[PDB]
């Protein structure tokens, strides 16, 4: 059974909603600035891509705001937006056939740090004081509440779960939902991801391994994937949600088919928890398998939404994987990293990337890799630097890499191409 996307919802830095989101990407401008959620002075990487979010304006009541972590607020806001755009009639829906697959790398990191200060008296006590125990503490300890929150918003009663595979969560959560619908475990799925990691503990853990950029003097150009002067990714927050359903059913109801997820696959490094080999062997195989399921030849790929975190090892890593899987076609296919503009929102980024591909497939414009000014010999492909590029897209590829060794890839094609499949 085939799965398609009928609705999209996005909450990215400088992109509240698909319109603004797309306006930002095609404009090539960035949303990476100096961190304002707290004082970055004590840390190495003091820049991040922060999303302008107003919970009250989104429609959350007092209990919901006091209850849910920032990441769940983003997820739910996106699920609602996707539900709305899908046009899927709530009344005709059978809750027992509606599921949820939410991805998240660090989940409630923000609420944990907030509560940690009250419990420990700002790090003074190991034996925390239960007198300052939040009534929601358990739900920050065990993030399961995130998928639940979304399920309650959309009326889901089918398979509901959280996929947490590091920086590939955004892709694996959608892939999981695709498998759910294909296997017949659900007819409608609300899938996507969200992460709100801009918090001291996360920044400090990335500084420890120097994974993030130390370029604090020029925040607007801090994220520079594939660039010769790159020195790490830029920490970001964000979320995106999609409405997925049976292909025939979406056609039958006359829904708008934003795209068909014709292929998805994931494999592991079995190499190192954060390190990567230059060969890109595993990712190549992942792309091969995804293409195999999709039945689409490598030469059909019209664009590749890269991982492109901006770290030395990563960018060079996937470049090798592309040439290994796409062969010569790798050199004659546009590749670009939206992280150059929205930063790396960890588990959320994969979903934002899927949303970006869907938007590209429709508008026929390939988003550029901003800040790409100095070329790197190890990254000798075409990364569409600085300016967007007009191009007819029918079949696109998107991949991601995450701590733990995870390598995932997904193939997205438009309705036109799907109907011809």
């Amino acid at each position: 059974r085939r799965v398609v996307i009928t609705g999209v919802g996005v909450r990215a830095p400088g992109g509240n909603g698909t319109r603004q989101f797309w306006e930002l990407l095609t404009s090539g401008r960035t949303a990476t600035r100096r961190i304002s959620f707290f004082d970055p002075s004590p840390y190495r990487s003091q820049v991040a891509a922060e999303a302008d979010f107003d919970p009250v304006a989104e429609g959350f009541g007092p209990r919901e705001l006091d209850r849910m972590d920032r990441a769940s607020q983003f997820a739910v806001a996106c699920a609602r937006e996707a539900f709305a755009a899908s046009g899927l009639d709530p009344d005709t829906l059978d809750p027992a056939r509606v599921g949820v697959s939410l991805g998240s790398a660090v989940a409630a990191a923000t609420s944990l740090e907030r509560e940690y200060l009250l419990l420990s008296d700002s790090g003074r006590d190991w034996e925390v004081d239960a007198a300052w125990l939040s009534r929601h503490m358990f739900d920050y300890l065990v993030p399961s509440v995130m998928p639940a929150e979304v399920a309650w918003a959309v009326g889901a009663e089918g398979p509901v779960t959280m996929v947490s595979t590091g920086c590939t969560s955004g892709l694996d959560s959608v892939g999981n939902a695709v498998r759910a619908i294909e296997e017949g475990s659900a007819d409608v799925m609300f899938a996507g991801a969200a992460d709100t990691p801009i918090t001291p503990i996360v920044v400090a853990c990335f500084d420890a391994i120097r994974a993030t950029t130390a370029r604090n003097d020029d925040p607007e150009h801090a994220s520079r994937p594939f660039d010769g002067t790159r020195d790490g990714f830029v920490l970001a927050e964000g979320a995106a949600m999609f409405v997925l359903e049976d292909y025939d059913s979406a056609l039958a109801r006359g829904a708008r088919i934003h795209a068909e997820i014709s292929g998805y696959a994931t494999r592991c490094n079995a190499y190192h928890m954060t390190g990567l080999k230059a060969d890109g062997r595993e990712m190549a195989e992942t792309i091969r398998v995804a293409l195999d399921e999709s039945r689409t030849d490598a030469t059909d790929i019209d664009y590749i939404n890269a991982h492109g975190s901006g770290t030395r090892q990563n960018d060079r890593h996937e470049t090798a994987a592309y040439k290994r899987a796409l062969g010569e076609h790798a050199r004659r296919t546009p590749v670009s990293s939206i992280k150059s503009m929205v930063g790396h929102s960890l588990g959320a980024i994969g979903s934002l990337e899927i949303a970006a591909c869907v938007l590209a497939l429709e508008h026929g414009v390939v988003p550029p890799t901003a800040n790409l000014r100095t070329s790197d010999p190890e990254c000798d492909l075409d990364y569409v630097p600085l300016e967007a590029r007009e191009r007819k897209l029918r079949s696109v590829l998107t991949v991601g890499s995450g701590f733990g060794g995870f390598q995932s890839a997904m193939v997205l094609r438009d309705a036109e191409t799907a109907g011809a499949a």
Binding site: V142, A148, T161, G166, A270, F403, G404
Partner: protein, 402 residues
């Protein structure tokens, strides 16, 4: 056909399958006061601790610095499961081996210490391992790297329902083309913050008598007792298994299913009954075929009543033996489902139903046939395993005798 060829258990009442199975059949629990820190200053004080596990004796000195207690237990469990199945990762195609685990708390002990150093000393004191020792995917990635498994892998989070969901997720993967999949879960949150966090659940027993604190389905039920540990098991394609030379297994994972309860206030019925019937259909087996039900065993009155009611609706009141061996270990979150599965397979293999400890009086209201005291020798061939996760997660799994 997906078989369970190898199991690895790390439980509060037994480090390893043999010790565990022995304690279960004998009703010995591994419950007691928390000694990881001073619990006398908190409302809840009892937990299922594993006290005979010294990481350095099971984990390579290289991994000790970067692993949380939960991960060390998972790696130990995983290794034992692979050799129990006589499976050599080095002798198998890397891409033909996957890893699917569930994780509820992640490396919380580890992250708590990193939070303290950050605000006590400063960001420069944060460990270079904090970046991957805490996140929920940690146990999948570490198991993957240690055994050179490169096939499709994942990590799921759904509180105590996750462990069963992980197993079902593995079944899906195997059926799509990956011959072997390591699956399971292990949790541990026995640090002051993790402890206080669990207490915030509002469902933790404040009893002081270890023999009478976790009493699912008992009229004196007053909350569950937290525990640390779990299980990892090796699942694989029937054909690939026999071809591998592995003709011996624990059982078959016949069917799986996950549902989610309606939002709070909807008044609509829970989805546990639906999950059960979905799992039975997937397995191609009817209610009458089930010989034993390993209940979630919430230990919280309102939840026990809900569960007893769903079981009754499917198999009829007192219509099928019900048991809750976790009374001997406590709730292990992502480890609970996996351990229940192991306990069920052992019951099928040994021809006896693992008994429930502690419970002495089951309310007529629940209408269930609970196995208490001694193991009941009914020689079951099909078992149903149930697990629920906080906020409404339901998970059911049907197993068959090999």
């Amino acid at each position: 056909s997906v078989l369970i060829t190898g199991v690895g258990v790390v439980a509060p009442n037994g480090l390893g399958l043999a010790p565990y199975w022995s304690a279960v059949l004998d009703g010995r629990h591994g419950l007691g006061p928390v000694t990881r820190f001073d619990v006398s200053r908190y409302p809840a004080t009892l937990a299922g601790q594993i006290d005979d596990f010294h990481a350095p004796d099971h984990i390579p000195g290289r991994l000790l610095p970067q692993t949380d207690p939960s991960t060390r237990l998972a790696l130990t469990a995983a290794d034992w499961a692979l050799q129990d199945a006589k499976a050599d990762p080095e002798s198998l195609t890397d891409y033909d081996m996957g890893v699917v685990t569930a994780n509820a708390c992640g490396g919380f002990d580890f992250t708590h210490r990193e939070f303290r150093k950050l605000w006590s000393e400063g960001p420069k004191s944060v460990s270079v391992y904090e970046s991957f020792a805490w996140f929920y995917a940690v146990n999948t990635g570490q198991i993957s790297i240690r055994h050179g498994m490169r096939g499709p892998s994942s990590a799921l989070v759904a509180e105590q329902a996750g462990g069963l969901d992980a197993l079902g997720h593995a079944r899906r993967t195997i059926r799509r083309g990956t011959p072997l999949v390591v699956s399971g879960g292990v949790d541990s949150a026995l640090d002051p913050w993790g402890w206080v966090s669990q207490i915030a659940s509002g469902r933790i027993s404040t009893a002081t008598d270890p023999d009478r604190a976790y009493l699912p389905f008992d009229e004196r039920a007053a909350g569950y007792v937290p525990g640390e540990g779990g299980a990892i098991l090796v699942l694989e394609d029937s054909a690939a298994a026999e071809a591998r030379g592995r003709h011996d297994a624990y059982g078959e994972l016949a069917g799986c299913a996950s549902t989610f309860d309606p939002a709070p206030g909807s008044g609509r019925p829970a989805g546990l009954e639906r999950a059960i019937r979905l799992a039975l259909n997937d397995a191609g087996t009817g209610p009458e075929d089930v010989d034993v039900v390993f209940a979630d065993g919430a230990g919280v009155p309102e939840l026990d009543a809900a569960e007893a009611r769903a079981i009754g609706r499917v198999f009829g009141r007192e219509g099928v033996p019900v048991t809750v061996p976790k009374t001997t270990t406590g709730r292990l979150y992502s480890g609970g489902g996996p351990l229940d599965v192991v306990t069920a397979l052992m019951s099928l293999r040994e021809g006896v139903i693992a008994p429930t400890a502690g419970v002495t009086s089951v309310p007529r209201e629940y209408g269930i046939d609970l196995v208490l005291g001694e193991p009941r020798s009914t020689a079951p061939r099909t078992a149903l395993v149930l697990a629920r996760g906080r906020w409404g997660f339901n998970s059911a799994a049907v197993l068959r005798r090999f």
